[PDB]
């Protein structure tokens, strides 16, 4: 049996336009551990995103944090795109600074 990832997209610090910050995509609750995560800027893959070391929660499900430096602006759109064996196609979650 398999478990599909939960996904949250958010910033390390409260967002302020023109101020450098970190964009996070936290995937969790998934099994098995193989997973593909991209961070997107205006629909395009950001290069050289880093991630945490694989670990897991008390119910055995895995979690990972993907992150990259970014400077939010009014018009730039950010998102996280996730694929996993449980997903027929990549799931995209947009960054919403109120979430």
């Amino acid at each position: 049996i398999q478990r599909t990832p939960k996904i949250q997209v958010y910033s390390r610090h409260p967002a302020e336009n023109g101020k450098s910050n970190f964009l996070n995509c936290y995937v969790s609750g998934f099994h098995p551990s193989d997973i593909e995560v991209d961070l997107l800027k205006n629909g395009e893959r950001i290069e050289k995103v880093e991630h945490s070391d694989l670990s897991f929660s008390k119910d055995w499900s895995f979690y990972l944090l993907y992150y990259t430096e970014f400077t939010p602006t009014e018009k730039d759109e950010y998102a996280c795109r996730v694929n996993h064996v449980t997903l027929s196609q990549p799931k995209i979650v947009k960054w919403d600074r109120d979430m």
Partner: protein, 276 residues
Amino acid sequence: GSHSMRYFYTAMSRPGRGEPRFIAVGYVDDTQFVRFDSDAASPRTEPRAPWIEQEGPEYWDRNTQIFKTNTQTYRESLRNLRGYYNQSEAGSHIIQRMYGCDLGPDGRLLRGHDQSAYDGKDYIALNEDLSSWTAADTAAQITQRKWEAARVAEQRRAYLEGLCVEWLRRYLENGKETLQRADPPKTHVTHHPVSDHEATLRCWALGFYPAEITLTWQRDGEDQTQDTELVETRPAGDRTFQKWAAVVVPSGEEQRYTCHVQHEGLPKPLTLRWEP
């Protein structure tokens, strides 16, 4: 406060793509401090918290020996479990182990833990007595019999009551400025109309450590468990955690709602309201 150490081992087969990957990470509470990955170019135990860096070469080499040995044993274990479940050589499988010790606020052993899973399901666990086993199914019973025959529990107990607590105490002292510091949540309430007649109130907690927190909404002093949207507590990337709870309320009833926050870093629980 109370503190724990855990190691989390993940061994993953991948037929046709080399030997099973073994990765181990160590935590004190919510702070990761080491890693080992058999897939690294030059596999070795690496520091992941500043306070562990002071450990000498002897320590790093000892850890590296331990994880290299585990890497080999888990590959055997994966072969064994595939057979215990009559599975084909085609599929990928995962063994997980999480183990460690809990200390109470006085630094004394509270209890030990040692549990394992196969493909995400409980497989075998050491009972709280650190002497007997609980096996999930007839396959895990084979492991249990093997471990009973080899007096494995005795080995686990000796570590959990011994080296585990001794080293945890050492780390707690070396990293006391962070490991023994609780950072309270920074909090606020936001308001977003959803329509002419309803609005969302969202209660935010940011910058807190450790991750354990309680965040709730009440209406006229009653818990709103079913009507509250809670997100999973999430890491900020700077050691701290974040969480929010949201409720949709009738426009004009906003002041009947209170957000309550409990956290180790808080002397007294907080009660917050929307402040227009």
